[PDB]
Each structure stands twice: as structure tokens, then as C-alpha cells.
Amino acid sequence: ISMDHPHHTLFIILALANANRDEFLTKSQLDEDRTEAANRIICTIRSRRPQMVRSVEALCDAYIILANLDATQWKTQRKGINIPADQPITKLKNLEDVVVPTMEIKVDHTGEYGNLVTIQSFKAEFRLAGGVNLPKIIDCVGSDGKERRQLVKGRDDLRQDAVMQQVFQMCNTLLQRNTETRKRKLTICTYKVVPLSQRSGVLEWCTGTVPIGEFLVNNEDGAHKRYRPNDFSAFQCQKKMMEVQKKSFEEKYEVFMDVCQNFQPVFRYFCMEKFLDPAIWFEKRLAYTRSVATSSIVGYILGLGDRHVQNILINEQSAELVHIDLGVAFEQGKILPTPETVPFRLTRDIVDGMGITGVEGVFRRCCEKTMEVMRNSQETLLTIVEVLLYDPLFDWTMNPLKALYLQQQSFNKVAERVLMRLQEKLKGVEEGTVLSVGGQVNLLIQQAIDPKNLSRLFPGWKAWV
Amino acid sequence: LENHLHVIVGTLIPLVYEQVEVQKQVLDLLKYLVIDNKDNENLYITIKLLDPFPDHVVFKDLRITQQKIKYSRGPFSLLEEINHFLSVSVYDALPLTRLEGLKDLRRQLELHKDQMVDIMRASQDNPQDGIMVKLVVNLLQLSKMAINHTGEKEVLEAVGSCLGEVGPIDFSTIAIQHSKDASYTKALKLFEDKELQWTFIMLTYLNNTLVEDCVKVRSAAVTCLKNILATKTGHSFWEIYKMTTDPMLAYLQPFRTSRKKFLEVPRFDKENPFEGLDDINLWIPLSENHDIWIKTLTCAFLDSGGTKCEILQLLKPMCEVKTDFCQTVLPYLIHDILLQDTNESWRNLLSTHVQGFFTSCLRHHFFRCCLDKKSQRTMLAVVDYMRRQKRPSSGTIFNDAFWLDLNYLEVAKVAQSCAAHFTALLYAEIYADKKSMDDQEKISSLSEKSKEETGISLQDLLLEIYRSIGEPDSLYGCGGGKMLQPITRLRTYEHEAMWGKALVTYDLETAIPSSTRQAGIIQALQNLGLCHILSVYLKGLDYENKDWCPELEELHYQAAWRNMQWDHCGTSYHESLYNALQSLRDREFSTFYESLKYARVKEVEEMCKRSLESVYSLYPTLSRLQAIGELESIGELFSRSVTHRQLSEVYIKWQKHSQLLKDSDFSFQEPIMALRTVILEILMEKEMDNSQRECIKDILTKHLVELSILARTFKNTQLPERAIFQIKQYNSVSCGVSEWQLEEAQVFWAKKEQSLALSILKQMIKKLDASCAANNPSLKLTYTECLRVCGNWLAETCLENPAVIMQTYLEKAVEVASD
Amino acid sequence: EAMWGKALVTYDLETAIPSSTRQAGIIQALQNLGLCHILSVYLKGLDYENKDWCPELEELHYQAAWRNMQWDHCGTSYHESLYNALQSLRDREFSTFYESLKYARVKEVEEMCKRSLESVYSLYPTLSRLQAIGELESIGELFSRSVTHRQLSEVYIKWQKHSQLLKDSDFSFQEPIMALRTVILEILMEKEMDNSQRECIKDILTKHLVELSILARTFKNTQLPERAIFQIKQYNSVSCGVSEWQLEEAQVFWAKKEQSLALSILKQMIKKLDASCAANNPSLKLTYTECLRVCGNWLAETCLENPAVIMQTYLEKAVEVASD
Numbered sequence A: 001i002s003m004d005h006p007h008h009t010l011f012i013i014l015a016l017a018n019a020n021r022d023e024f025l026t027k028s029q030l031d032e033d034r035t036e037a038a039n040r041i042i043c044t045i046r047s048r049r050p051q052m053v054r055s056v057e058a059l060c061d062a063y064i065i066l067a068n069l070d071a072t073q074w075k076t077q078r079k080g081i082n083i084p085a086d087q088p089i090t091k092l093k094n095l096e097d098v099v100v101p102t103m104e105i106k107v108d109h110t111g112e113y114g115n116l117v118t119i120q121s122f123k124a125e126f127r128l129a130g131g132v133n134l135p136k137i138i139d140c141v142g143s144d145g146k147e148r149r150q151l152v153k154g155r156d157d158l159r160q161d162a163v164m165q166q167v168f169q170m171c172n173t174l175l176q177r178n179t180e181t182r183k184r185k186l187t188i189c190t191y192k193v194v195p196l197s198q199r200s201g202v203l204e205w206c207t208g209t210v211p212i213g214e215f216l217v218n219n220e221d222g223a224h225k226r227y228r229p230n231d232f233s234a235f236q237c238q239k240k241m242m243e244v245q246k247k248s249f250e251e252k253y254e255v256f257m258d259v260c261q262n263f264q265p266v267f268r269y270f271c272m273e274k275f276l277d278p279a280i281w282f283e284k285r286l287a288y289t290r291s292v293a294t295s296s297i298v299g300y301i302l303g304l305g306d307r308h309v310q311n312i313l314i315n316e317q318s319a320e321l322v323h324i325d326l327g328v329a330f331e332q333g334k335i336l337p338t339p340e341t342v343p344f345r346l347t348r349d350i351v352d353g354m355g356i357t358g359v360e361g362v363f364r365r366c367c368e369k370t371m372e373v374m375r376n377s378q379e380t381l382l383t384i385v386e387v388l389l390y391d392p393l394f395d396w397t398m399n400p401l402k403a404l405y406l407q408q409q410s411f412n413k414v415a416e417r418v419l420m421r422l423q424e425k426l427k428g429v430e431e432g433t434v435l436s437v438g439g440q441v442n443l444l445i446q447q448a449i450d451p452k453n454l455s456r457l458f459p460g461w462k463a464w465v
Numbered sequence B: 001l002e003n004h005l006h007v008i009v010g011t012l013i014p015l016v017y018e019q020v021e022v023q024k025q026v027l028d029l030l031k032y033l034v035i036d037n038k039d040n041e042n043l044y045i046t047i048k049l050l051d052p053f054p055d056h057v058v059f060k061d062l063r064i065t066q067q068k069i070k071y072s073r074g075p076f077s078l079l080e081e082i083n084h085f086l087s088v089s090v091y092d093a094l095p096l097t098r099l100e101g102l103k104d105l106r107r108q109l110e111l112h113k114d115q116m117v118d119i120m121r122a123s124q125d126n127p128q129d130g131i132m133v134k135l136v137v138n139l140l141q142l143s144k145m146a147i148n149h150t151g152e153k154e155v156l157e158a159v160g161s162c163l164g165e166v167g168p169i170d171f172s173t174i175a176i177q178h179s180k181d182a183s184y185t186k187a188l189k190l191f192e193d194k195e196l197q198w199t200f201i202m203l204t205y206l207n208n209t210l211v212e213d214c215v216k217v218r219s220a221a222v223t224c225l226k227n228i229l230a231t232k233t234g235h236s237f238w239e240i241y242k243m244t245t246d247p248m249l250a251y252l253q254p255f256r257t258s259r260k261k262f263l264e265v266p267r268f269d270k271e272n273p274f275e276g277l278d279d280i281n282l283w284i285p286l287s288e289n290h291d292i293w294i295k296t297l298t299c300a301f302l303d304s305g306g307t308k309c310e311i312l313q314l315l316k317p318m319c320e321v322k323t324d325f326c327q328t329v330l331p332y333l334i335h336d337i338l339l340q341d342t343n344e345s346w347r348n349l350l351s352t353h354v355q356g357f358f359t360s361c362l363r364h365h366f367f368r369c370c371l372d373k374k375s376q377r378t379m380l381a382v383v384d385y386m387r388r389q390k391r392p393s394s395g396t397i398f399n400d401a402f403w404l405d406l407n408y409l410e411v412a413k414v415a416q417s418c419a420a421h422f423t424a425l426l427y428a429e430i431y432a433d434k435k436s437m438d439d440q441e442k443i444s445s446l447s448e449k450s451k452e453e454t455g456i457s458l459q460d461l462l463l464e465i466y467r468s469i470g471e472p473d474s475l476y477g478c479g480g481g482k483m484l485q486p487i488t489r490l491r492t493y494e495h496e497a498m499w500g501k502a503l504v505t506y507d508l509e510t511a512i513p514s515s516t517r518q519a520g521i522i523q524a525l526q527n528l529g530l531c532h533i534l535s536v537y538l539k540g541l542d543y544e545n546k547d548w549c550p551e552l553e554e555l556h557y558q559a560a561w562r563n564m565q566w567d568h569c570g571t572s573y574h575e576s577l578y579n580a581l582q583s584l585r586d587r588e589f590s591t592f593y594e595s596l597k598y599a600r601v602k603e604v605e606e607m608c609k610r611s612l613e614s615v616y617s618l619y620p621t622l623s624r625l626q627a628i629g630e631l632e633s634i635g636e637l638f639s640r641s642v643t644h645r646q647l648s649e650v651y652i653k654w655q656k657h658s659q660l661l662k663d664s665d666f667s668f669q670e671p672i673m674a675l676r677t678v679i680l681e682i683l684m685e686k687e688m689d690n691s692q693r694e695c696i697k698d699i700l701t702k703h704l705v706e707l708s709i710l711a712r713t714f715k716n717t718q719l720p721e722r723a724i725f726q727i728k729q730y731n732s733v734s735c736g737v738s739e740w741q742l743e744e745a746q747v748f749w750a751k752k753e754q755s756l757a758l759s760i761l762k763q764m765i766k767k768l769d770a771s772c773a774a775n776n777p778s779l780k781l782t783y784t785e786c787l788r789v790c791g792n793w794l795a796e797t798c799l800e801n802p803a804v805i806m807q808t809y810l811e812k813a814v815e816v817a818s819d
Numbered sequence C: 001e002a003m004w005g006k007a008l009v010t011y012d013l014e015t016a017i018p019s020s021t022r023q024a025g026i027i028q029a030l031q032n033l034g035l036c037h038i039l040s041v042y043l044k045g046l047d048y049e050n051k052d053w054c055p056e057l058e059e060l061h062y063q064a065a066w067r068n069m070q071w072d073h074c075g076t077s078y079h080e081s082l083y084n085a086l087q088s089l090r091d092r093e094f095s096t097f098y099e100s101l102k103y104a105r106v107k108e109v110e111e112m113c114k115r116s117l118e119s120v121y122s123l124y125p126t127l128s129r130l131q132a133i134g135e136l137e138s139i140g141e142l143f144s145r146s147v148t149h150r151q152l153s154e155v156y157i158k159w160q161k162h163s164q165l166l167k168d169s170d171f172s173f174q175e176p177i178m179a180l181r182t183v184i185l186e187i188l189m190e191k192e193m194d195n196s197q198r199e200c201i202k203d204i205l206t207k208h209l210v211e212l213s214i215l216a217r218t219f220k221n222t223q224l225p226e227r228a229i230f231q232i233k234q235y236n237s238v239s240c241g242v243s244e245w246q247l248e249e250a251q252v253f254w255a256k257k258e259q260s261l262a263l264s265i266l267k268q269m270i271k272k273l274d275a276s277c278a279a280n281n282p283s284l285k286l287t288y289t290e291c292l293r294v295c296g297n298w299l300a301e302t303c304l305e306n307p308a309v310i311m312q313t314y315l316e317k318a319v320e321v322a323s324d
């Protein structure tokens, strides 16, 4: 596989062999067996392609070295900071053999791969846009006159994101196969993730997108401030919701409804302000609703969780939703303290952005169409998920450390339980009762939009938003 | 001379035919212009992007040189030809000059469909910029300019023949995008100041109107240029604009002059403003006084009211002579007036009078009523322009919407009446948001409140707006008390294609208007496969009836041609199709071609009439034109001698065109597949040879199998059984085994009779086993497929234990079994 | 299996079938699917081919004439006798009415008796037809003399008791009796000429049509319930806005698998009942309770509403709102 298609497979083998390279560069039997086997595979590939392997290793080393650099000094500045000279990323120039890692490669059945865009140079300015560990944004200049922006992350595991992206690609193929969804252009937005080590990785930067939280509840120029100025600020809503956390459930409900009454959705104006032509506005709103529907259904099938405001991006040009930070999945969010009680995020802002009809119109029908496609392909999806979950390095089971981080062999049993739960979801068996596609969609919608469920959620989830 | 070359060529080309004496000079000029100057760098591109010369004895030389020049550096592919067509379409000319380009586009389209497969696949990522939508809308605009001109009939026929070649392909888009000039947007982006943008727009419009034939508009236009260029704003415009390259820059250079003192407009102020605009008669026009009304309104704006901008108060001479300039300039006038407003007097006055105007359009004689559509479109354009601008308060886009106090429900209803469906939906959304906003400060509730005060129900309005848009899913979104009405139930029925329910409800309800009732009954019967019942119903409808309204005749003719009932004897689509099939039966090919041409022209004209906002409005006409095209194609095959090979490639073309129509709706797919089988059965009925009768039979059998598969795909069960019945009628099977029998088994499975399909398929397997040991290469595929289908069906229904299913059926298929 | 749509499609498609059987099947399938006007126009069209005109065609024409109440289509057979008897009943000529009923009974019992009589199932059509003729003779004296409220009420009482007797009988035998009953009620409404007991006749007709809708729903038939609801809509002017038959209409929509329309009807009924009165009226107690309970159960099944709202708004309200 590596000999025939080196660009698709070389990075994965290097990542397996370079799992522990972070500590080496800075200053269980299965693990060393895997490392030795990956070393043998890389030795063979270098035997057939020396230059490619050497260049890819140098690029990976440069990426890792860039990752461990501390950016606390420049956390405040957003304009951009020049890369330090000692970083090996700047010295790299004219890398003809290596293809851009954060790029999709159309798989060629013939193995020449003659004409591909390749790295030429790296821009000397890296930009900071926020984050928990301050990820760095860098630009890669390709062989042609184009600029590719990449996101370099450290002290984080990106393998889970990559495999979630692969499952999303498979779901996209399944949706494309069906005529009913193909007519509606129902797709799941995807991005390329290239993990470099256990704690370091690089992944595509989605240009032209903005987080929904940044657009909605920004304190200085958020939508809820420019619009509805007399309503509660986001700070007051968050403070009240944090204060009512320790109280009883009825107090939580009363406080939540009080906040929601004085905090009204203003997300509908996104397409209105960005697209002034009514035809373009209608097209973008339809695309937004369809993206929300397909994302919600796919996330429910895979049990996606932790869908807070900062984990969703909206493309300014296309008005489509992109989901990031896919670490928590397979209904593991319900195992958390103060558990998540919604299949997907369908709060008042997302519903309002759909239109005056809300979920009554295109959203519901797209949900039934996606659900029907999910049902018709239940066996293939079951096989894909079964292959995925038994990955030794997949690490999906929730542990107390992640439980505390998110909110500031038993593996076989939990895995087979997740498989049976997913099977019940796919066949439509909910709470022990078989349901039609329409009935299952209605149940999911009512569970998502119920203020009773929203009130019990973590204030970090920002249900009122 | 690159700029004006195409105009000269398009003017000189037609005059060749008229008379030989002028033809000699015209031909000499064209020859010197093209053939002599091919070896020139400047004119090479302009000659390359030129309309091909007409194919005649006169133009062989010119055509040869043009073809040689165009295909230099390589020939063109399918895509290329389309890009060249649009690129030469960028040049503006009379529609008659494009006839040869239309013919060449048609030929290139019919030669290759496998390439349109590749274009359709490529345009999947960004459906908006797909070239197919652009080509269709380009042909449609070229048709609109063709109306009321000398060569409308020939142009429309070519446009329809081109549109029939593509057919109703699924474009994966919703809204038609009108073409916009790329340099125009860049030029507007160039000027940051609002007044400079007005300068550029007005000067561009005046430069464009400088060339028009009428001498009066030129006399005022030149004065307008002299006045505008003289002021300070003109000088700023010139210094900021001289950097770019544009022919208007060279055209306007002699007009510009250097003077020490800039021209100062008279800033005279009336003693009391608002006096001219206070009259109600000014704002509300009469039925046919739009041309005078717009001029009077514009000049009243110019009459000593506001107009701080120095550009304005200089446009009156041009506004007086031309009305197009008047509706062009009105929104800018109103924006300038409201910009300088103090104490909000202008805002209140204009809001009140605009409300009066918009209420007068929706009042439906009456004292003010039936306002012409052009005036409504003008005021809608004013509102649209005002919405985009930013208010002096530096507020937000929602505030920017309310430059004037507007009840957007009325404006949305007017826009819907004017066919601006997306604009109507946006205005309805704005009105709902505003209503909720004022309600909170102090859909069913909003709908009843709107019905109580404004007299227009909001939910109903959204209903017809979403219905005009044509998107299927959005229809179910609108809801209220109106689903109880039988009409809404019926339309929901035919939208979902539950034809039995629609037929029952149509029969039951009598309050429905009669014509709609019989139309729905006939349509439901036709889609249910009840052809004989429909024929007898139509025959019985004759008694106790007056003259039929045209829809009854149209439906009767459709039933006649679809049912092959040839005894029965402006022309509409199905009437023309029936007459064409009769003429093909009677070998009167001249009338056949004439009727097909008339039908094409009528369909294209009918599409030309409407506003063309949603792509869904285009699909029925595309289907009709494709049907006409296939009929015309079969006409030449039948007229001359018919061979087996020609049948082969025509059927191959049929599968290719069907492959292009993979994602199209069944409502558009079914008429073509009906016409195909009718034509094939005509060929059967009048072939008169033993050898080719079998070939026609095989083609009909394959077509009917494909029709059955297509109907099964769309969950329609009546049509497949009718197709199987026809296959029975034309193919008596003595061998007992055939490919279509497997399709019959699949159809019976689809109708939820497992025993029937299972019995047929086991009988087929036994006959196949007895007949041969799968040595026959043709029967290997059918035998393997029958075995596999039987195994899968028995596994699904659990009528047989797994061991027998595996050993006898599924393993047998593998053992039995170049693409 | 009463799959009459498939029967229509196959009868229309196949031409090798002998003609008389083909039109007989087509007419029967059209009639039992509720397509009344389509059947009438189809019968009118077939009259063009009058060369071959066999007894089954007269029989089906007369059945359609008396069922659809055309009243103009002019040995005597069963449906011919029924049509003539209804002619006489409108014409107030009771002598020929009685003689026609007598002849119909005699002929029908003769035809039944000539047979071998080996199986019980052969007896049923004759029994149904004799019951229909008996009910016609029963209404004869009611229409003959001065019509009274209590006489009509007691006749409806015998009708409902006899319907209770035929609870297990197949729909094929029950349906003609109900059709004759509704024709009787429409005739009695037409030729009454008094306002006072006209509302009584209307109420009895509404009850009969509600019972017919329930009976057809029990047999998984959808078209006839819709026809009954329609025919109720005509004879009843909806002014109060709340009535028992509207609940049956909502039930019929749910059976047709159109849940949204049924839910909308039921919610509108609940809102109108809540607004009009505070459930003090004894008459509206059962209707309001049933509407609330059915709406709650439907919402629970289809899962549009959360359990809290279903419990508080519909089910607990139905319990607290509520002589056997």
C-alpha cells in the first residue's frame, strides 16, 4: 500500500514511528512492537524512495519543533508574530518531493502521481487566534502561486479527529450514493487532519469561517450586543447560570427560563447582512439549514458530544456549518458529570437562523432523508464503526481526567454496549419501541429543543445561546 | 477597431442577400476586413471571438478563413465551444446575428453527450457556476430580445432546438442568477465615496445612450456630459479613474475641458419645500400613464427639493427625453433627499406617500387602481436600492431596511404579484421580524393579526411564495387552518404522487371549479395507468356538455396520442404532437416538420413570456423540447431508408440522453419515455418487413424494461405492470425464458406479492436449467441473476432454510458465472 | 382481499378478459372505492357501444342509479326493483312500491332456493338483500302516515340493534344495507317539508354516517369514511364549530395516515371547546374528554410533544374534566 500510494500512507507510518519524538526533540510490549514494525516499513520505503522519506522526516521534525514553542509571550497580540530564526521550519525551501500534508489527494489507481502541488517555502509570520494551548497558524507556499494556511497544535491528540473525519468521509460517500440526498446536496463538511505524534499534530485551517460563538456572543462586537441592546449581556446570563448550578432542578428551570425570556435569538441576521441579494440569501439559508440537518443526524448516529459554541464554525461565503473538536463521541458525554441530555445542539439561535418556519420546513425533511439513508446502510455503517472502535489507539472511552478537563476487560463490554446502542439507533428502536423515520426525527427534535433538558446542561455548553 | 468590429460585421452580414450590387461592395469590405487582415496581432483575438458566417455559396471563403483562425493552436472540445459561445455572447448584438452560432452549438451538442456527462460531474462542487445553467439562461435572454423583431421566428426555432438537446438535466441549483459585468463591480469598488459612485454610474449610462439612434437623447446627453465633467466631482472622478484602461475614458476625453472655475449649479431654494411632493396624484399613477408619471415624479424631485449632490439638478434634460433614465435615477434621488433630512419631515412624507402607492396597488373600477406593472417594478427597485444603503445613524442592516416607514407585508405581496419571489420572501421575513419587535417592546397569531388589520394573511402569502419558488421541502413548512381546505389537500397529494387519494378527493369534492376538477381527474387517471377508463370517461364527458375550455382539449389530445387512438381528428403542444404523429403515419413529412417547428416556437415563446426567477419553471419546457427533438430526429430516420445500424445508434443516443437525465424528476422524465414507446410502436405498425420487425421489437422490449425500472425507482407500481403487459403483447415467448421476465418478477416483488414473483422466478430457473447447462453466453447473465435474486428473496422472506438457499441458489449463481 | 385499486388497474390493463366480466369488475371496483361521479360518467360513456347490452349491465346501471340517487335513469331484477321502489316512495304511490318489494322478495327467495345449498356462505347475499327489502317495507308505513319524532327514533333503534346483530358479518354483506339506510334518510329529509323534525332526521343521519365511518375503519377501508364525512359536511352547517362527527373526521384522517391534519383538527376542536364553555354543559362533557384523551394519546404515539406537556395539558385535563 505504501509503495503504490506513498502520499496517503507515509505520514501515518511516520506518526506511528515518531510517537515519542516530541520529548526527544525538545531535549507495553505492543508499543515497541508497533514502533519496530513501523521502522521496518519506513526503512523499506526509504530503500525505494530515499529523498521523499528524508524530506518528510525533516518536515515532521520542523512541525514538531514549531509545536513545542511557547507562545504565552504573544498570546495577546493577534496581528501576527514573525517566526524565531532558530525554528527549522523557516530554513526549509523548495521541497519538490513532499506534497502539502494539509491537502486532499485524489486517489489515482495508476501509481505515477506525476503532477501534484508541493511545498516551496513557509511564510515567516505565524498568527495566533486563541485557543486553550495557543495553537499557531502558519502559511505554506506551494509549488504554484497559492497560499495554504495550516494549524499547528501541541499537547493534544489529533488521531481521534482524523478517524472521525474518515467516518465523516464514508458518510459523505453514502449520502452521495443515494439519489434523494444527492439531489439535496446533503454533505458533511470535512477537513484534513495529519497527526504528527501522540501530543502534536497539524491540520487544515478552514479559511473564511468564523466560530458561531464569536459571531453571536462576543462581548465587544457580538450579535447580541449590536442587536437587542436592552437585553441581558452574555456575562449576566453566564453568571446567573453558574450561580444556579448548585441549586435544585426547579430553581435551575426557573432561572433558565428567566434568562431565555430576556435573551432572544439574533442569529437570523447572519445571512441577511452577509448576503443582500434575495436569491443568494435564499440559497445560503437553504444550504445552512441542510448542513445543520445532516450534521445533527450524523452526530446523533455517532453520538457526537460537547457541541458548544466554540466547537462549531460557519463558513462566511457558503453559510455552512463545520464541526471541530470531535474528541467526545459515541454518547460518552452522557457519562460525564452534569451529563449532556440532548442528541445535538439545536438551541434557539440555530433554529432562528433557519427562518420563520424554524424546524417545520426544510430542516425536518432533510432530517428524515438523512435518517432514511442511515437506515438503508445500517450494516455498512455497523461494520465501519465496529472496525473503528476496536482500534487499540482510538481511545474513546471516557476517563476521569478528561471528565474534569471538559468541565472545569471492561473495554469489551463497553464496546459491545456501544455497538448495540448504535444498532438500535440505526434500526430506529428507541426506548424499546420501534419507530418510523419520521417518528424518530420528531423524538430527536423534541429532545433537542426541550427547555427542560437545556436547563440541566452545563453553563459552559451555553444552552441559552 | 476591435471594439466596434462585431457591430459592423453583424450589420453587413444580412445585406448580402438583398441585392447583388450592394452585395459586391459589402463582400469586398468584409473580405478586406477579415481575410486581408488575418495576419495582424491586434485583430486576431477579435476575429477569433466573432460570429461564424452563414453557410452559403457566398461565404465559403470567409467561413474557411474564420474556421482556420479560430481552431489555430488546437481544436475545441465540448466545453470549449460553450465557453466560446458565451464569450462572443458578451458582445451585444441583434439576435438575428446569432443564428449560425446557435446552429453550430446545436450540432456540437448533439455530436457529444458523453462530454456533457463530464461537465455535469465537474460542476458538482460549485453548482452555481456550472456552465449549463449559464448557457440555458443565456439562450433564454437571447430569446427575450428576439421578441418584436424581424427575425424572431427563426431565432426562437434555433433556441428551442438547442434547448431540446440538453433536456431537463438536474442543475442542482434553485435561483437563476442574472448576468453581471465583472468590470462594473470592480469599478464600483474603486470609488469609496458615495457621490463618486453616482458619477461613474450616470456617466456610464450617458455614454451608453450616446450611441442610440434617436438624435434628441444625444443632444441632451452631450450637454449632460459637458455639465457633469465641469464640476469638482467630475474632476475628482477623472483623477481617480484615469489609472484604468477603458474605452469610455478615451471617448470622454475630448468632452472634458480645463477651466479655472468649476461649474456651480444654482442652489436656489423654494420658499416652502414638500409642496410639489405633497399631492397624492403625483405618487399614484393611472392605468396607462406610467411614462408620464415617472417623468413627472423625477422632475418633481428635481424641482427645488433637496439634491445636495452637485451631480443632481444637471440630469433633468436627459430625464425629460428618456424614461429608462428616470427609473434609473429615482432611487438615487430619494437616497440623496433622505441623506440631508432634518427633523425627519422628508422621511415621514415619503413614508406616507409610498404607503399610499403600495396600498393602491393591492386595493383589488376604483378611483386609483390597476397600477401598471412597470410602475410597481420601479418602486420595488427603489425599495431594494434603499434597503442596501447604510443609514446616517451608523446603525445596522435591519435598521438600514427602514430608511422609510414601510409595512413590508404589502411590499412583499406586490413583489410576489411582480414575480420577485425571493424578494417577496425576504420582505415577508423582515415584516415578521419588525412585527415581533414592536410587539415585544410594548405564525398563526401574526397571520390572524395581519388578516385583521392589513387584510392579507401572512401564512397564506408565504404559501404562494414558496409555491412559486418551487422548492419541494419548503411547502410542508407552511401550515395553519388551510390544510383542511380540499384544494391544499389535493395539491399535497399530487406533490407526493399519491394519485389514488387525489382521484378520490377530486371525485368527492364538488365545490372545486369544474375545469380544475376534470383536469385533476384526468391527470390522476393518466398517472394511474387507467388508459381505457380515461378514454371512456372522456367519451362520456361529451354528453351534456358545452364547448370545452382549452385544458379539456389539451388533455384529450394528450390521451389520444399516448393511447395511440388515431381515429379522432392556436395549436397547443399536445395537439401539435398528435398531428405530428398522424403525419408521420401518413408520410406527410412536410406538415410533420411544420408542426414540430410551430410547437418549438410556441414553447420557447411561452418560456420567454414569464419572469424566469426559479429554475424549476424551466424543467417542463426542457422536457417538452427534448420530446420534440427526439421526434424530429426519428422523423429523418423514418423518411429515408431505415437500417439496423441507424436504429442501433439512435437507441444508443437515447440511453446516453437518459443517462444525462438520471437525477431529474419523474414528472419530467415520463413524457419522453411515453413518446419513445409511442414512436417505436408506430415503427412496428408501419415497418412492413420481417427482418427489421424483430429489431424494432427488441428495441421496444429494452425500452419498456428501462421504463419499468425507472418507474420502480420512483416507487410507482402501475406503469411497470402496463409496460410488462405491452411486452407480453408484442413478444410471445415460446422459449419461456427472457430477460424482461426477470423484470416482471421484480415488479411483482415491488407490488408486495412475494408468492407471485417467487413462483415466476422459480419457473424461470427450472426452464433455464432444463434448456441448457449455461453454455449459451447470452443466457449466462440472466440465469446467474435469477439464481442470485431467488436466493436473496428467499433469505429475506424466510420461506426456505439457509442450507437449501446457499447450496441450491447462491452457490449455483457463483458456479454458473465481458464487463 | 378488497384491494380494489389493483383490481381496477388489472381490469383496465387486460383485454383478453371477456367483456361482460371486465366491465362488471371495473364497475364494482369503482363503486366500492367511493368513485361515484367517475362511475356515473363511465357508465354514460359505455352507452355508446350499445350493440351488446347484457343483463349485468342493466343490473349495475340500476345499482349505480339508486346508490348515486340520479333518479332519471329509466323479469325485473333486484336492483331494478329497489330503484323502482324508491321511485314510488318519492312519488307517494305506495301500492306499486309494496308490489315491487313483494316481487323482489319472491324472486330472490326463488333464486336462492333453486340452488343446492351445500355451504352456509351461499346464504349470505340473499339474507342481506332480504333484510334490505324488509327495512324498505318498514319505512314504508312510516312515510305513509304522519311522521313523528318517536316513530323515527324507534326505527333507528331497531336499525342499530339489527346492526349489533350483524357485528361479525363481513363488510360485503353489511355495506349494501348501510347504503340503503343512508338513501332512505336522504329521501326522508328531501320529502319532509317541516323544520321541526328536520333537525331530528339530520341528527339520525349524522349518527348513521358516523357509525358507517367507524364500521369502514374497522375493516381498514378509507374511501367510504371520507365520503361519509363529506356527506355530513353538506347536511350540517358548521356554525357552533364543535360536534361529535368532527372527532370521527379526525379519526378517519389518522387512519388515512395523515397525522398532521388529524392533530390540527383535534387541536382546533380543543381550543374551540375550551373557549366556548368551561365544561359546565353536560352535553359537551364526553366530546371534550374524548378529544383531550385522543389528542394526548396521539401526541404520545407520534412523539411531537414532550411528556410533561402531554400529561399536564391533555391527559390530566381530560381526567379532571370528567349516564353510563
Ligand SMILES: COc1cc2ncc3c(c2cc1-c1cn(C)nc1C)n(-c1c(F)cncc1OC)c(=O)n3C
Binding pocket: A129, A130, A131, A135, A151, A161, A191, A203, A204, A205, A206, A207, A209, A210, A211, A310, A311, A312, A313, A324, A325, A326
Ligand atoms: C481543523 O481544525 C480547526 C480548523 C479551524 N479553522 C478555522 C478556524 C478555527 C479552526 C479550529 C480548528 C481546531 C480543531 N481543533 C481540534 N482545535 C482547533 C482549534 N477557529 C478556532 C476555533 F473554532 C476554536 N478554537 C480555536 C480556533 O482557531 C485557533 C477559528 O476561529 N477559525 C476561523
Ligand SMILES: [Zn+2]
Binding pocket: B364, B365, B366, B369, B370
Ligand atoms: Zn382596477
